[PDB]
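Tutorial sheet, problem 5. The four components below are modelled jointly, 1168 residues in total.
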Amino acid sequence: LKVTKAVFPVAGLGTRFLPATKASPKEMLPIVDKPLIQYAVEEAMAAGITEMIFVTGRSKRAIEDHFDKSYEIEAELQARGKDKLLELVRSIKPSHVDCFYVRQPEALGLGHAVLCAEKLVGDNPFAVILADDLLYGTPPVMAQMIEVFDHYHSSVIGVEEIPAQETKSYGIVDGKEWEDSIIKMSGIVEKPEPNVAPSNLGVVGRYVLKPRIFEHLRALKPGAGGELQLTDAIQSLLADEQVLAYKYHGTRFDCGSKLGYLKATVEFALRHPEVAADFEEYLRTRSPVLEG
Amino acid sequence: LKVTKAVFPVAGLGTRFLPATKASPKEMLPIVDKPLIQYAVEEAMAAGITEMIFVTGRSKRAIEDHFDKSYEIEAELQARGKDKLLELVRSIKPSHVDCFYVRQPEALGLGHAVLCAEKLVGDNPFAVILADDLLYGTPPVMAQMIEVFDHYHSSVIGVEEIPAQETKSYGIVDGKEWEDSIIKMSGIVEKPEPNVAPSNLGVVGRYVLKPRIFEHLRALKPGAGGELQLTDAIQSLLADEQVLAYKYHGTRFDCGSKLGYLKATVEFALRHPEVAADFEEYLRTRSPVLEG
Amino acid sequence: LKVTKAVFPVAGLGTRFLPATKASPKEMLPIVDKPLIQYAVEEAMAAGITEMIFVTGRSKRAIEDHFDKSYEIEAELQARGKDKLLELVRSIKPSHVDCFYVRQPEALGLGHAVLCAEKLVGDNPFAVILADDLLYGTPPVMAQMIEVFDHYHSSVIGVEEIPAQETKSYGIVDGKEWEDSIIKMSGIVEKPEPNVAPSNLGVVGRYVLKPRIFEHLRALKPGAGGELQLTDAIQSLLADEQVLAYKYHGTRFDCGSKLGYLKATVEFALRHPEVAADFEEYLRTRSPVLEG
Amino acid sequence: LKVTKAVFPVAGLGTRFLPATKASPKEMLPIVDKPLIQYAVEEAMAAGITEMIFVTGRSKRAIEDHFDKSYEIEAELQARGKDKLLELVRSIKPSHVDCFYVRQPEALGLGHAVLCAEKLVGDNPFAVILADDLLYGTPPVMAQMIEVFDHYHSSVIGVEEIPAQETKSYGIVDGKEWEDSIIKMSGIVEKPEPNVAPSNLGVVGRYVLKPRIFEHLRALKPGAGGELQLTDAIQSLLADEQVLAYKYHGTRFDCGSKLGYLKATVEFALRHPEVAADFEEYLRTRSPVLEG
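Model answer (structure tokens):
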């Protein structure tokens, strides 16, 4: 059983980024020169995934027009004779990668977004990648997680040791450590108060899910708006079969926050061949007072 | 004669920002949490301008959907009970500000973009603002320039002392200094070699133009694609009436370049009440090695 | 004072055409092979008008994409070598015609839509054309009305004799005939009861307005939703200066109704070079029974 | 093995409908008050199909916005208190129906569009429905064809008797009749000359295909542009397993042609609750002269 598909929820309101996210989801925010969602798709590609399923909401066109062919932009590029840039634009969606679109009509949360993709995933394991968790890993984090999935044939939840006083911001897993970095999960709890959290292992926006999850999602009684909690479906699933938590190696930038977006911008600029040296020299010599 | 209108060319390919500008013009790039074009519109508003004319090209919808009312986003905001954010979203286009759209069908340069707006400006003086020149001024730069225009009733070209070896990147003005910061222009030349440049005063993306400019634009024989050089029209205009260069005070970020975009991000983050303190402490303590 | 501008309110919900108008304004409905709004723009062009001002609302993109350039459609035509269809596509917006867009954020009616366009019209007389009134006239109706305006330099209201029992569907004018088909208006009333209507001359969706109309729209007490009844502004205007009603020659199809749209389709098909002869023969021989 | 999925190629350039199809695919053309593609989706729904796969090209947004939720149109309906029109709008995409989108970046024909959808169909039989073939059948034609598929578990090709001199416009099947209206196919040929055509049974835009078809599409030598002739893949398939042609009962309108579109408009108008009686009376009494 090989994972060839990834589901990307890309209806991010980005309240912490208004007004920038007025007309585009937060997953389209650029880090230096590349949208968050493209980093995420490239991470999926590095894990062997070739079918990208985008679950869109408002401003779907920012996502669609990013990955779909643009005749007008290739015209402008061809007209300016910019041949390297032409191939850069084509590489956003290589020929062997497919992009499919499905709608989440109402912003009803992650579990609902996953369930919307059910009949596009079919009877197949699949990745779920939240692009506002920007991850740097060697190899990429989803590639690490596909290694785990290929070995154990169990769902894999990406987790990270987080500060004990911040457990109210994370889903928190419980279980016994198995091998290095792998926890056989006995439970998952959504945003526990620090004094009740069963561990310091918080869920990050990376999952490999076996298709049985859809069955458990469908069984949940929804909330007020109709929200389905993916955590409740995961909790229900591990009662029936093995579910693993994987402590990935790498660095996370929480680009659901402006601070994390700024850290990501700084770190990736300093790795960017076009600007790294000049940007470092700028940080070293900048004046503290902005003159108007 | 009061300036109530501003023309914003917003068909920026952003070759230096591909792939981020695949589906949105470079003028929509965010600085922390606000698109460049919104900074520019706010600068025009600070100068008393109330009619915003956007000259669009590819991906016009990123611009239109930013300034036009969104029913879906206000629905999401109302559904989440986020009332301060609701007013933030409404303030993108205050009730007393109008936004009009006109097309530049082909990317044929700035003079062509200005001429496309002729019959929307009418027989009125108007501002031209290039949003990828991000300016910080107290008061804002266009407000400074409208002060000059209201006093002299002559076109005003925003200029800046630039390094002598970089004159090939700028239009360069010539003339006699009049009062503090004001040059009565005798000529303007597009991108001269350093050893021939008549001054070190380079044109930045800010203009106040009297409507006679349209006549001079129309008189120009176009280039290969049909490009019209605004510089040639300005050169032609000053032969007939007074045209002034204004040395504004403030700081410019060249956000047509990735480096300038990064400097702008850093400087405006350190002024941003939500992140300034944490971002400074991050810059002070960050590790030099990114761990994968 | 020549009329060079026309205002086209194109926020038509087409409740009578749902679900067809789900994602497109009713003014984009095709008559045989051409949208209603393109018939209206061609009528304006025949009257010498060269600036088209579209007051958009919901689904603005169907209108914008129709009149703006499309590279992808021209790439598909180019790839199929289909040549005459290129001149046809280019003819949708000839080089000497400008298209400008302004938003009516809330669908508040015709008088309000006219006021939204004020700063695009400036201090100029202008046509107002409701495209869901499809008019066939030789010469075109707006061309007839501009001839009237050029002769009298007064606002012109298009009218037609309507059945006496239908006056509650129309604005109804009153006055005295002055030359063949020209009424010097003494009054206008919005939707009178038949037994109270002062004439049988009902207003159709064609106007030539002098810019004094904007001051009269502002003087109006708004309706409960904020509507400004254009009829009441015309009533106010004619107290200060001459306003004329013009009994145009030609045929109207009320394409605000499904029945008028079908009649229009039949009549224009029977004049269409490609289908007229074959469609008439089909209407002559068609079987009344539809086999299922 | 039930058919739950239908593939709708909707990249139709509608060269015969320009300029109407400038900004909208021909499959969005309305018949009275409903787009062709919605008739096609309703026919699929009547056959028990619940996953609609749209293979888009140029102007994908007209198709997407038709089937996806619109908050602004529902806000305008809500503000006008128009209630039954809400159920009508919601009925465009009922809760139990999923809409998925895949791109055909280059307009390379039907067989190629079917292969583009392969990974959305998976290992499942599927319907293929060309919406510009408007079919009226009681029960609907795809419902008739699914009954055939459920009975024989073989691919089903929709066919109709066509005039012998028109075979160069059709794929033409050959075989032996097996039950009323069912032909066990021995061959199929794309557009034979009349004197060479093996039958008068022409293929219409309705198919039920088993997923073995994808392997046969891949085995085909591509056309000069990269096209894959679906007819040749069906010819290849029937050498390995049973393929049936089904002579449906009902009436076809070729809405790839302006004349068929007009006939469809007339016939469906004459069955429409709101206009049938009044439209028939207009056709009976209409004057042949159009007054200008």
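Marking note: The two ends of chain D are 61 Å apart (CA to CA). Full credit if you identified this.
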